[PDB]
């Protein structure tokens, strides 16, 4: 299955939605002083698992 | 057969009934290890399904 | 809590994510013994 | 009935709430609460 030609929603769902679910969940729970930096760091630190 | 079925029909012919009864028992008793318990239910009742 | 959750919420908080991943993989692989394969997946993946 | 909360609300008021809040969001009247109550009463029959 090619990803280049997927519709936008399906593309984002197959790429970043799962890691974003857990990432924003942890973010909402912790609420750190630098939310964007924390989210980016979460994405980078857990990318391999997704 | 099986292999050439649609996704839902495949799961319906394979694991859905035992999962329904398993999740029923799980939901009723609510044991300390829900996932292990569900797996054990599946294994202990596989032959009947 | 847990014990006092509604059933849907209970199952959703306990086994639903791993079941999502498990039934997905099961649907992909389609092994000769689907139930044993699923139970085994749940077991290999319980920690996460 | 004997239904769980979510199923009860889903079988009773959720659809009319969907259409009602959608209309509310579209129109945004000076009277949001009164407008909503009136929507529920005037469309009660279809649900």
């Amino acid at each position: 299955v090619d990803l280049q030609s997927l519709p936008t929603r399906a593309y984002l769902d197959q790429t970043v939605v799962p890691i974003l679910l857990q990432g924003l969940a942890v973010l909402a729970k912790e609420r750190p002083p630098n939310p964007i930096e924390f989210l980016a760091s979460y994405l980078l630190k857990n990318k391999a698992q997704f | 057969d099986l292999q050439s079925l649609p996704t839902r029909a495949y799961l319906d012919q394979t694991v859905v009934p035992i999962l329904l009864q398993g999740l029923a028992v799980l939901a009723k008793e609510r044991p300390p290890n829900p996932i292990e318990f569900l797996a054990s239910y599946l294994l202990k009742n596989k032959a009947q399904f | 809590d847990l014990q006092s959750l509604p059933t849907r919420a209970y199952l959703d908080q306990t086994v639903v994510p791993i079941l999502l991943q498990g039934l997905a993989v099961l649907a992909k692989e389609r092994p000769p013994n689907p139930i044993e394969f699923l139970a085994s997946y749940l077991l290999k993946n319980k920690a996460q | 009935q004997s239904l769980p909360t979510r199923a009860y609300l889903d079988q009773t008021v959720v659809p009319i709430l969907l259409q009602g809040l959608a209309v509310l969001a579209k129109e945004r009247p000076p009277n949001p609460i009164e407008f909503l109550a009136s929507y529920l009463l005037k469309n009660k029959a279809q649900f």
Binding site: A10 | - | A24 | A7
Partner: peptide, 24 residues
């Protein structure tokens, strides 16, 4: 109640059959 359980499994199956890999 079996209704809640069947609802749960319905959610699960829906997500599985609508996985991006299964549709496309």
């Amino acid at each position: 109640a079996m209704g809640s359980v069947e609802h749960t499994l319905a959610d699960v199956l829906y997500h599985v059959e609508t996985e991006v890999e299964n549709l496309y």
